[PDB]
Amino acid sequence: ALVPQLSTISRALTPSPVMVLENIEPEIVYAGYDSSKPDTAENLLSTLNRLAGKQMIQVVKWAKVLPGFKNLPLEDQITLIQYSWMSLLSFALSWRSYKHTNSQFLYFAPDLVFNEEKMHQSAMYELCQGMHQISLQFVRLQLTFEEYTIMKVLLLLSTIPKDGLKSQAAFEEMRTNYIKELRKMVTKCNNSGQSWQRFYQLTKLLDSMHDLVSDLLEFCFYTFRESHALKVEFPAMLVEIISDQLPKVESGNAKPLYFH
Numbered sequence: 028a029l030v031p032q033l034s035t036i037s038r039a040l041t042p043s044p045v046m047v048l049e050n051i052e053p054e055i056v057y058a059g060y061d062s063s064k065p066d067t068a069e070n071l072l073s074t075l076n077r078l079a080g081k082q083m084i085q086v087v088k089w090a091k092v093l094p095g096f097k098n099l100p101l102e103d104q105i106t107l108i109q110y111s112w113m114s115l116l117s118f119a120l121s122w123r124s125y126k127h128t129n130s131q132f133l134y135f136a137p138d139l140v141f142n143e144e145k146m147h148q149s150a151m152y153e154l155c156q157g158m159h160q161i162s163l164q165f166v167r168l169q170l171t172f173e174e175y176t177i178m179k180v181l182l183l184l185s186t187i188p189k190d191g192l193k194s195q196a197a198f199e200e201m202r203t204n205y206i207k208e209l210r211k212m213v214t215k216c217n218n219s220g221q222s223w224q225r226f227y228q229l230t231k232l233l234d235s236m237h238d239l240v241s242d243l244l245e246f247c248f249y250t251f252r253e254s255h256a257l258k259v260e261f262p263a264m265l266v267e268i269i270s271d272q273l274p275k276v277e278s279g280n281a282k283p284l285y286f287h
C-alpha cells in the first residue's frame with residue numbers, strides 16, 4: 028500500500044567516504060610555463076601564481092562535493108578554504124612530487140618541474156627545500172593515496188578564526204569524522220602498536236605543515252604587497268584570497284589546530 032521511503036539498494040551501493048575522495052580528486056592542472064622566457068624570479072613566481080589560481084578553481088569545485096562539507100554554514104566553508112589554501116596546495120605539490128618523481132624534484136605541474144636550479148632562480152629556495160622535505164617524508168613513510176586524501180581534508184580543517192566559526196559544533200563533527208577515517212585507515216590486520224605508531228607519524232606530519240605554511244605565507248604576503256616593485260603578478264583568484272587572508276593572519280586572527 029505505502030511506498031517505502033528507505034532505499035536498501037541505495038544504502039548498499041553508496042561508496043565509502045574514502046572512495047568518494049578518490050572520485051572527486053581534481054585532475055592535474057598545467058602551469059602554462061613558457062621556456063622561451065628567462066628563468067628570473069619575476070617570471071617563475073608569476074607563473075607559479077597563475078598555476079595557483081588555476082589550482083584553486085579546482086579546489087573549490089572539489090570542496091563543493093566533499094562529504095560533510097555542505098553540512099557546515101556557508102560562511103564557514105568559505106572561511107576554511109581561505110585559511111587553508113596554502114596548506115592544501117603545498118601538500119598536493121609534495122604528493123605530485125612523490126608520485127611523479129619519487130620526490131627527486133618539485134612537480135608543480137607536468138610542464139613545470141623544479142630541479143635545484145629553478146629552486147634557486149625562483150628566489151624561494153629555502154621554502155622550496157621545505158616543501159621538498161615533506162615530499163621526502165612521503166617516501167620514508169610510503170604514504171598511500173587513501174591516507175593522502177584524508178590528510179588533505181584534515182588540512183582544509185586545520186586553521187580556524189581565533190574568534191570562532193559560525194558553528195563550532197558542525198566543524199568539530201566533520202573534523203572528528205575525518206580523524207576517525209584516518210584512524211581506521213591506519214588499522215592493520217591486529218597490531219595496535221604499529222597502528223598507533225603510524226597514526227602518530229601522520230599526525231606529526233600534518234602538524235609540521237603549520238610551520239611550513241606560516242613561512243610560505245610570510246613570503247607570499249611579502250611579494251603580494253610589493254608586487255609592483257618586484258614585478259610579481261597575481262591572478263584575480265589569488266588577489267581575492269590573499270586580500271582576505273593577509274590582514275586576518277597578520278593581525279593574529281588565524282588559529283592553527285594541532286594534534287601534538
Ligand SMILES: CC(=O)[C@H]1CC[C@H]2[C@@H]3CCC4=CC(=O)CC[C@]4(C)[C@H]3CC[C@]12C
Nearest residue numbers: 072075076079116117120243246247250
Ligand atoms: C609568489 C609567492 O609568494 C610564492 C611563495 C609560496 C608559493 C606557493 C607555494 C605552494 C604552491 C604549490 C603549487 O603547486 C602551486 C603554486 C603554489 C601555491 C606557490 C605559488 C607561488 C607562492 C605563493
